DNA sequence: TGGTTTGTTTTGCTTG
DNA sequence: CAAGCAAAACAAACCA
């Protein structure tokens, strides 16, 4: 097993999180929520004391890879919609 | 206000 | 080298 959560990469997980939404787009917070609810390894690492490292990598992957694109959100103070780049 | 989130980038290290 | 994990500097936007 490549990582402690399996053979899927962070990018792969982010992809599954987004593909799981009916609208094919999720905010950063929703992607975190999907990890904690969907990946066994992260189930007990959603708290502030242990989520810093992996959340940082999620933000890192989202910005770094062209596979993901950011879309301006609707309304005041809401963060971007993240989706798969066609 | 002043701490927290979100987002962008760069760097270090390990593998195939 | 490319893929990827991990750590981290910085800064605009948020928001309690
Ligand atoms: Ca991107």
Which domains, and CATH codes, for chain A?
1-86 (1.10.10.10)
The percent of chain A in helix, strand and coil, each rounded to the nearest 5, is: 50, 15, 40
Task: Please give the Cα distance from A3 to A69 (Å, whole number).
Answer: 25
- Whether nucleic acid strand C comes within 7 Å of the CB of A10, the answer is yes
Residue whose Cα is closest to the C1' of B15: A2
- Residue A77 CA to nucleotide C14 C1', Å? 6
DSSP string of A51-71?
A: HHHHHHHHHHHHHH-TTEEEE
Q: For A39, phi and psi rounded to 5 degrees?
A: -110, 115
- Residue A79 CA to nucleotide C4 C1', Å? 26
Dihedral angle over CA of A2, A4, A36, A70, nearest 10: -40
Q: How was this structure determined?
A: X-ray
Q: Are A25 and A2 in contact (CB under 8 A)?
A: no
């Amino acid at each position: 097993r490549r990582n402690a959560w399996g053979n899927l990469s962070y990018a792969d997980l982010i992809t599954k999180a987004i593909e799981s939404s009916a609208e094919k787009r999720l905010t950063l917070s929703q992607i975190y929520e999907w990890m904690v609810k969907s990946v066994p390894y992260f189930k007990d690492k959603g708290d502030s004391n242990s989520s810093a490292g992996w959340k940082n990598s999620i933000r890192h992957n989202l910005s770094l890879h062209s596979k993901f694109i950011r879309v301006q959100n609707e309304g005041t103070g809401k963060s971007s919609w993240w989706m798969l780049n066609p």
